[PDB]
Every structure is written in structure tokens, then in C-alpha cells.
Design a protein around this ligand. Structure first.
Ligand SMILES: Cc1cc2nc3c(=O)[nH]c(=O)nc-3n(C[C@H](O)[C@H](O)[C@H](O)COP(=O)(O)OP(=O)(O)OC[C@H]3O[C@@H](n4cnc5c(N)ncnc54)[C@H](O)[C@@H]3O)c2cc1C
Ligand SMILES: NC(=O)c1ccc[n+]([C@@H]2O[C@H](COP(=O)([O-])OP(=O)(O)OC[C@H]3O[C@@H](n4cnc5c(N)ncnc54)[C@H](OP(=O)(O)O)[C@@H]3O)[C@@H](O)[C@H]2O)c1
Ligand SMILES: Cc1cc2nc3c(=O)[nH]c(=O)nc-3n(C[C@H](O)[C@H](O)[C@H](O)COP(=O)(O)O)c2cc1C
Length: 607
């Protein structure tokens, strides 16, 4: 099916494709799509996977055609899975795109190696093919505030649109509510993703759309201290046909705090147990419902919607119309402004204060919107990825997780709890008579991998939870040694605050070093002396040996905090290569960056 014909038969001149893995780019495209209306135009948003972009050459057949791309970048500057077909096409095609008018807004994070590689490539590639750029590439940075980057871009975009096409700003619910009163409890979604009763009746293959319900066999606290809670879980995937390797990620679909959900109901004065359905008013769309329907409000707010994350500007704007108090409405209304005091208050009152929806309704009492509209505005609750801490060579039937619970106090005087980590923390291991706890998950393949050759040495840097994939790495290297194969050096550079507060897998690691599996265990305690001692410090001290391994062909792996750690560790490695390779700093940078392309300097960082 040609998206161009689709556009002709539905009267649309604007099409916004989205490359998204966790919904953000998708939401951004939907917002741009709805925006067309204010300019006498008609837009639609679309998943490029459900189409064939070769059809872009046929875009000129629509008067005033305009295509916009909202694209997120993932692993190693690669495209999202739903944009992979698009990517591959752009790399092999040489079609003349003269007459095609486009604009690209890339979603990225500058703490990653290839910043907005996807957006940059699409934008650069369409021009090469002859397309005409209607407005500059947008560089959204989720390390700063993607939302602000977006509204800033959006504003300038439409102005360019008005200018080039000669249109003007002439100066709405997407769904409609249907309360299912006579429904059979059996036809109601209870939190499953995908087909109805998929949880109750499990059948492979399990993926993001059909998550497996494993049994939590273990859930134990890893840290000795008590300042934080670091836990180690083991999920039994027996009978799932699911495969994985150390380095892969497990994604989980969490549930919101029952208490938080109950408070939202109460403050909105709404029976959360009412079953209902929200139907897309756009008869032509694929997205019939914002989430599985019919379903009760409670279920929606617990399994399908994001109620903890600080709301984006469009959500605060719509809500404004439900605040009777004058000063309270003024406050919410301005929060959507491009800049000025409106932008300042947003960043301050919403973002920095980290106010979730309930905190907003509490700190703006006059706000009393209907629960069904909110359900339409809120983002879908996303799964959380964790680096499997087990090797499929040793635990083929189990998936291990190592995580730190997220809990902190806000400026707003409240106590925020991380969705997936507090949820995971409360999962009770299977009991002699226990109750299977539901931990909806699926595996996500990655490029993070042990060397093809067991003889190849490995340098692993993972402070804090970043130690996660390495537990599996060391598990496998031991297994290999037990298999009688020759195994090169296996060094781990771990780090934490204090040896009595949060040293993870202390016993397991020490035993591995005694068995000979873990060649070297080097740990940096950042808080046992006035000055901070980090992993990069230990790396420098060992500059001599590391350079030898590096020059010999060893593989480097960095996992954990991307914001600072990754940056410091890479800088030290530049240092090591420059000083001992005798080359210039900029040559060392070239050098290290080339190891990445050879797959010998792998990264698994997050924030
Ligand atoms: C590829 C990848 C691999 C990962 N691997 C692991 C892993 O193996 N182990 C692990 O523990 N995590 C890992 N994560 C992180 C994990 O996916 C979750 O982000 C993390 O567990 C928190 O999720 P949550 O739902 O509990 O918290 P959420 O409800 O999602 O809250 C997270 C947000 O809370 C805010 N926040 C946290 N602390 C503060 C603070 N003190 N002050 C202000 N704001 C704060 C930040 O905005 C943070 O993004 C990984 C992430 C990625 C992307
Ligand atoms: O995630 P998580 O909770 O597992 O990790 P985390 O507790 O935030 O960090 C784990 C270890 O990394 C240290 N660290 C902090 N910043 C670093 C940096 N810039 N470079 C290298 N190490 C750094 C931390 O020290 P501090 O906690 O002392 O920063 C701690 O010792
Ligand atoms: C596993 C993972 C890998 C990422 N890799 C990159 C990357 O290489 N470059 C970049 O600029 N941003 C990277 N990001 C950040 C995302 O591009 C950014 O968070 C984007 O807003 C996500 O959009 P989505 O919700 O539409 O998928 C990564 C995020 C995750 C979670």
C-alpha cells in the first residue's frame, strides 16, 4: 500500500514518518500531524515500516506535498527497528527525488558516540537524492531537554512552511469515550499487551508485543549497606524458546504503584473500576485505541500509561482548560511557550522539580479534568531495559538482572519512586506455595559481545550496576576454561562507594579470581578517602599492561553511567594510547574510535 495514495484518498498533503523505539518520536510526529490543521493543511503520521519509502518519488502528485521525519537514533548510530527498511533503502537507492520537499527532526542524546546519526543521515541523504530541504535539521538532545529542542524546532518549522507554501495560521480530542457497562469480565484487558488473554494463555514466540511471563526464582539484596537498595533477580524462562547471549538486554513491562494510582482516582473523583473504551475518531487510522481496550481506568493507569514522568508541554496546555483558579490556569497555559518565563517555569516547576501528574493535580487544586481525557493525553508506559547479568552458556533457562532502585526526594518536597525498580523490588520469589508474580518481559539483541576467539583478552570497565553484563561475561569465560579451551586474560575494573556499603557480587567475584577465571579484579572505592578514586584512575595506573593488551588485540567494554563515567574512561584510554603508543592525542582519538568500528571497544551505557 502506497502512502501517497493513502494520502490522496484521505485528503492529506503532509506526512510525518516516525522512527521510534520508546514512543517519543512517535508522539512528536503525532503532534506535528495535528498541527497541520492550524495552517489549512491536513496531516497524518506514519510508521515507515508499514510502508515503502521508495514511494517518496510519487509525492509530487499531491499538491503542496510535504514530508517530515522524526527519527530517533539507537545502538551505534543505527536506526530504530521500524525504520531499518527505510535505512537500507536510502543506502542502496539512487532515485531522483527532485520535487520532494522535506524536513527532519532527529531525536538523540549527546552522551552517546554517534549523536543523532539517524536524523543526520536521513537529512543528508534526501538532499543528495535531489529532495529540497524546507527547514534545517533539528538536533534534539535528550541529555538537555528534548521537549524544548522540539517545540523550538516546531515553531521555526511551521514558519518556514507558511513562508514557502504561502499558507497562514488560521489561529480537539483524538478519541471518544465508550463506557462498557454490560461487558463480560472475560472480554476485558487486564494489563496484557497484544492479544486478549495472552498472559493467561502463553504461547511463543514471545516479543515486545507478546511478552513472556517468567517465574521470579530469586530476588535478593546485593548491597551490605542501606543507603540504597541494589538487587539481583533471576527469571526462569524455561519453555519459552527464548534465546540470548551475555551482552543482550531484557526488557520488562512494569506496573505503577497501586497507591499512586489510587490517589489519582480519588483526586479526580473517578471510579477507577469502570470499564471503558477510547475509539479513534479518525476512521482511517490503524491506531484504534490509545492502549488495549476495553479496559478499566485502574488497569490503564497501572499497566498502560506513564503517570510518573514529568509531563511534556502539550499535556500541560490541554489540561489548562480544566483549571478554574485564574493564577493556576495562567501558570499551566504559559508552560507551553517557546521561550521566556513560560519555558523557565516549565523547566523549573515541572522538570527540575520532577513533578508527576499527581503532583501537578495536587499543586493545582483547581485542575479537575475528566479521567478519560487524561488517559488520552498521557504517554504509554514503556518497558525498562536491563543488561542481562547471566551467560546463556551457564544459565540457558534463566535471565539475570542487577539493578539499583530509584528513589529520591524532590524540591517539591515529595518522594519520587522509580517505576520499574520499585516494582521489581516487590516481586516475591516463587514459594513452596507462593504465587507466581507477573514480570512481563522479552529479550532485545545487542552488539555487545565477548570476542569470537576465547583466546582474545578482555578489558571490562563497569562501575556500579555497569558491572551487570560482566557477571555474565565472567560466567562464560569460566565455563570456557572448564571446557578445556585456552582463554586470554579477563580483567574487570569495578567501582563503588565503599566496601561495606555497596560492593556488588563481592563473593562471586572473589571466587572467580580464585578459580583463575577472573584474571584481575580492580576496584575503585570513591568514598574511603578525601579524594574520589574512580575506575579511570585504576586504568591509568595500569597504562603499561593495558596498552600491551590493547596493542595485542584485546577487546574493551564499557558499561554503566554514560553522562560522566563513559566520557572519563574514554579520555583515559585516549591518554593511554597517546602516551604509550607514542602518537599524538588526536591520533589516539582516531585510534580508539577505529577500535569501535572493529568491534573491539564496545559500549553499553545509559542514564
Ligand atoms: C540499555 C540500557 C541498559 C540498562 N541497564 C540497566 C541495568 O542493567 N541495571 C540498572 O539498574 N539500570 C539499567 N538501565 C536503566 C533502566 O532501564 C531504568 O532506567 C532504571 O532501572 C530506572 O527505571 P525506573 O522505572 O525504576 O525509574 P523511572 O520511573 O523511569 O525514573 C527514572 C528517572 O528518575 C529521574 N531521577 C533518578 N534519580 C533522580 C534524582 N536523584 N534526582 C532527580 N531525578 C532523578 C531521572 O529522570 C531518571 O531518568 C539500563 C538502561 C538502558 C537504556
Ligand atoms: O548506576 P549506579 O547506581 O550503578 O552507579 P553510581 O553509584 O552512580 O556510580 C558507581 C561508581 O561510579 C563512580 N563514579 C561517579 N562518577 C564517575 C565518573 N565520572 N567516572 C568514573 N566513575 C564515576 C561512583 O562514585 P561517586 O558515587 O562517588 O560519584 C561510584 O563509585
Ligand atoms: C539503548 C539506547 C541506545 C541509544 N543510542 C543512541 C545513539 O547512538 N545516539 C543518540 O544520539 N541517541 C541515542 N539514544 C537516545 C535516544 O535516541 C533518545 O532517547 C530518543 O529520544 C528516543 O526516542 P524514542 O522514544 O522515539 O525511541 C539511545 C537510547 C537508548 C535507550
Amino acid at each position: 500500500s502506497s502512502f501517497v495514495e493513502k494520502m490522496k484518498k484521505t485528503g492529506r498533503n503532509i506526512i510525518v514518518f516516525y522512527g521510534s523505539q520508546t514512543g517519543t518520536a512517535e508522539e512528536f510526529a503525532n503532534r506535528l500531524s495535528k498541527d497541520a490543521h492550524r495552517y489549512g493543511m491536513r496531516g497524518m503520521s506514519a510508521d515507515p515500516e508499514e510502508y515503502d519509502l521508495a514511494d517518496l518519488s510519487s509525492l509530487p502528485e499531491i499538491d503542496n506535498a510535504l514530508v517530515v521525519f522524526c527519527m530517533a537514533t539507537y545502538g551505534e548510530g543505527d536506526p530504530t527497528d521500524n525504520a531499518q527498511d527505510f535505512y537500507d533503502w536510502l543506502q542502496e537507492t539512487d532515485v531522483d527525488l527532485s520535487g520532494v520537499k522535506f524536513a527532519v527532526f532527529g531525536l538523540g542524546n549527546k552522551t552517546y558516540e554517534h549523536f543523532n546519526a539517524m536524523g543526520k543521515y536521513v537529512d543528508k541523504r534526501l538532499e543528495q537524492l535531489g529532495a529540497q530541504r524546507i527547514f534545517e535539521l533539528g538536533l534534539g538532545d535528550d541529555d538537555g531537554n528534548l521537549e524544548e529542542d522540539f517545540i523550538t524546532w516546531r515553531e521555526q518549522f511551521w514558519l518556514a512552511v507558511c513562508e514557502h507554501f504561502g499558507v497562514e495560521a488560521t489561529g480537539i480530542r483524538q478519541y471518544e469515550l465508550v463506557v462498557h457497562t454490560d461487558i463480560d469480565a472475560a472480554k476485558v484487558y487486564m494489563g496484557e499487551m497484544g492479544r486478549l488473554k495472552s498472559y493467561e494463555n502463553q504461547k511463543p514466540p514471545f516479543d515486545a508485543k507478546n511478552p513472556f511471563l517468567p517465574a521470579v526464582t530469586t530476588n535478593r539484596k546485593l548491597n551490605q549497606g542501606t543507603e540504597r537498595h541494589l538487587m539481583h533477580l533471576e527469571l526462569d524462562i524455561s519453555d519459552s524458546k527464548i534465546r540470548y547471549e551475555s551482552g543482550d538486554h531484557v526488557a520488562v513491562y512494569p506496573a505503577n504503584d497501586s497507591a499512586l494510582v489510587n490517589q489519582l482516582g480519588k483526586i479526580l473523583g473517578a471510579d477507577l473500576d469502570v470499564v471503558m473504551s477510547l475509539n479513534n475518531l479518525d476512521e482511517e487510522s490503524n491506531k484504534k485505541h490509545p492502549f488495549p481496550c476495553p479496559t478499566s481506568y485502574r488497569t490503564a493507569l497501572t499497566y498502560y500509561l506513564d503517570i510518573t514522568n514529568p509531563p511534556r508541554t502539550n499535556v500541560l496546555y490541554e489540561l489548562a482548560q480544566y483549571a478554574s483558579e485564574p493564577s493556576e490556569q495562567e501558570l499551566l497555559r504559559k508552560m507551553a511557550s517557546s521561550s521566556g518565563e513560560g519555558k523557565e517555569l516549565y523547566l523549573s516547576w515541572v522538570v527540575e522539580a520532577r513533578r508527576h501528574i499527581l503532583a501537578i493535580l495536587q499543586d493545582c487544586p483547581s485542575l479537575r479534568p475528566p479521567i478519560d481525557h487524561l488517559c488520552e493525553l498521557l504517554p504509554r508506559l514503556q518497558a525498562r531495559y536491563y543488561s542481562i547479568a547471566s551467560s546463556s552458556k551457564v544459565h540457558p533457562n534463566s535471565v539475570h538482572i542487577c539493578a539499583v532502585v530509584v528513589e529520591y526526594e524532590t524540591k517539591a518536597g515529595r518522594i519520587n519512586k522509580g517505576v520499574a525498580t520499585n516494582w521489581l523490588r516487590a516481586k516475591e520469589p516463587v514459594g513452596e506455595n507462593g504465587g507466581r508474580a507477573l514480570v512481563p518481559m522479552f529479550v532485545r539483541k545487542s552488539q555487545f559481545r565477548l570476542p569470537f576467539k576465547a583466546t582474545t583478552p578482555v578489558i571490562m570497565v563497569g562501575p556500579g550496576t555497569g558491572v551487570a553484563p560482566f557477571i555474565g561475561f565472567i560466567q562464560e569465560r569460566a565455563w570456557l576454561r572448564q571446557q578445556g579451551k585456552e582463554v586470554g586474560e579477563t580483567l574487570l575494573y569495578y567501582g563503588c562507594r565503599r566496601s561495606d556499603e555497596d560492593y556488588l557480587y563481592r563473593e562471586e567475584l572473589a571466587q572467580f579470581h580464585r578459580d583463575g577465571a577472573l584474571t584481575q579484579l580492580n576496584v575503585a572505592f570513591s568514598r574511603e578517602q578525601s579524594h574520589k578514586v574512580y575506575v579511570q584512575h585504576l586504568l591509568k595506573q595500569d597504562r603499561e599492561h593495558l596498552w600491551k593488551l590493547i596493542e595485542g588485540g584485546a577487546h574493551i567494554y564499557v558499561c554503566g553511567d554514560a553522562r560522566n563515567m563513559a566520557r572519563d574512561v574514554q579520555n583515559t584510554f585516549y591518554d593511554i594510547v597517546a602516551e604509550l603508543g607514542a602518537m599524538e592525542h588526536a591520533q589516539a582519538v582516531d585510534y580508539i574510535k577505529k577500535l569501535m568500528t572493529k568491534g573491539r571497544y564496545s559500549l553499553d551505557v545509559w542514564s
